[PDB]
Amino acid sequence: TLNSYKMAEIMYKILEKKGELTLEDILAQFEISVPSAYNIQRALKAICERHPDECEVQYKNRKTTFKWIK
């Protein structure tokens, strides 16, 4: 059992470095399953919504994409 929120915090600072994140980036970083990555993505979305001046969730028909906008 892994804390999805703690994992998402790791991704959030990777977002700041990288500028942009998708589910594939979570999968590559952690080497985990798709369902697990979606749990982290859900927690990452919650973190981004706490900082709308820094992060932008670009939900589009292709895929959810996190963008650093600070």
Method: X-ray
| Stated length of the chain | 70
For residues 66 and 40, give the distance between their C-alpha atoms in angstroms, rounded to a whole number.
13
For residues 50 and 39, give the distance between their C-alpha atoms in angstroms, rounded to a whole number.
17
CA 35 to chain centre: 14
For residues 38 and 27, give the distance between their C-alpha atoms in angstroms, rounded to a whole number.
9
* CATH superfamily entry for domain 1-70: F-112 protein-like (1.10.10.1470)
DSSP E strands in 1-70: the ranges are 20-21, 55-59, 64-68
